[PDB]
């Protein structure tokens, strides 16, 4: 699995669908991280790939 830091959005005016990581508080482009809008409706807390590297205990939490 490649590092996905390139999926991070640091642009103030970006209008792309994006989801916030609850582990590092960075914004991630949804298409880049492979999460559709429909799936994101059922996500309680997203944990990005780099956060789940840092703590392999972590998993995205669904609802």
């Amino acid at each position: 699995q490649e590092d996905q830091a390139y999926c991070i959005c640091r642009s103030s005016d970006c209008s792309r669908f994006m989801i916030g990581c609850d582990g590092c508080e960075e914004w991630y482009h949804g298409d880049c991280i492979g999460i559709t809008e429909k799936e994101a409706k059922h996500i309680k807390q997203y944990y990005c790939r780099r956060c789940k590297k840092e703590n392999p205990e972590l998993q995205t939490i669904f609802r």
Binding site: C14, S15, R16, F17, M18, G20, D22, W27, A40, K44
Partner: peptide, 9 residues
């Protein structure tokens, strides 16, 4: 989750 700018179609 915290999300932004969904197409919401």
């Amino acid at each position: 989750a915290r999300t932004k700018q969904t197409a919401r179609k």
